[PDB]
């Protein structure tokens, strides 16, 4: 399908935004390449793609939240710098074949992700654009650096004997910040209502975790053994109905590309 | 020595950190990531850049309630790289004043954990600022300025990094100790009320001042600055710093703008 198509535009139309907000310089250059080597390779702009979304949505135009969702992927760049470090997840390749910090080095790697994060900021609020008043970028940098914050964060509680019969039913309790940020920044950018901007936050937060529910099923804590394959993607599709009613409220005509989204994603 | 400058400099830290203790409570959940925040930022200072930030304040004819959250911040955002700076990928240091650094007691993982959410508390808590009693249009001025401040800290870093009149120590020493001296300066000048002019006449006065720091110290004594000068050519830079940080002040008034030339007056003088 198409969603695919225009999903893959959006996508491209970024990664254009993308290597202009970064370029080749000398000062300082390494870090500015080291920023790239990361920040431009083969991914599916989903976050920032997801801002665009949350703004055309919400009454505005794609280009007005295009260097907030620069920002938002930019902080998922400087975000898995910093997880494929050995003190994080240690991973030596991941899509890449080498890590940034295999590369570069672990001093270089983690200064980029500070550049990056320090950019990503500078271009939300490098005051732009649609001259969109400027008590709004505020917001959207506030909720862009709330992100982050979730992003650091990123069971017991419970317990019972029905005695009919040693039925013992024990409950527990258990990211994806950077998702609902796009979606908020861009609802936002685009002229949200505080209850738009709500909306979209809920929206954000079930496929955040319907994205992981579905990538899990596709294979120390997974998402598989835990309940079943059979539950684990019941439990996906209830997330998606979720994900639907947070869109009523918008406009009927404009609210296809993030129900073909949230379909996108469980329909692997 | 002079007192009730010291007087001045203490009651105004005393100010900052209760400010800052208050911005970064012990609650869980974190609790060892908010832990190791406290840990670096509540740690005794030395707490000029929130001075400097809160006087530039008041000079250019604002409160010392309005500067407040943007001198937590750049506070907030020294310890975030300070932390960074630590770790063994990049000075390596163990210690730090007899006690010992942020990641050999809650590890790297956390330590790097402990840097972001300072840094991303920093930017947070400029923008996040009550008494808007003033127009939100600089405190976006305030938050590019914070930006600058951290490009700078990782232009400097970067350079740090390089094991006859050569002399980049310079470079290295502006971008990394004197910009968040200089960040301090001018977004306490912002939102104080303070012309685009006054503004940089603080950021060059931040800057004197920021050299001067590490040209005596390096004195009261891997290249320092005495080294490359010689001992006595860096005790006169530092007056000619201490003396044309003085002249960026002039065209200010001579009663508010006591502290910052005090400050001056009290590096120098060791």
Known sequence: FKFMSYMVNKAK?????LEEAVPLREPELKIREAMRYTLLSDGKRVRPMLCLAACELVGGQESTAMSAACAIEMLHASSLILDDLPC???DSLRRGKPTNHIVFGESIAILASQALIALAVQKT??????????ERILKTVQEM???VEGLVAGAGEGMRFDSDTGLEHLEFIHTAALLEAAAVMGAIMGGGSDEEIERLRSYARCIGLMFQVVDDVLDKLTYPRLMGVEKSKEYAERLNIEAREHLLGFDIDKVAPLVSLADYIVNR
Do not use: L, Q
């Open 145 to 147: 650096v709330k992100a």
């Open 88 to 90: 994080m997840d240690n």
């Open 13 to 17: 139309s970024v990664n254009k935004a």
């Open 125 to 134: 609020t490098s005051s732009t654009f649609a001259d969109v008043p400027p």
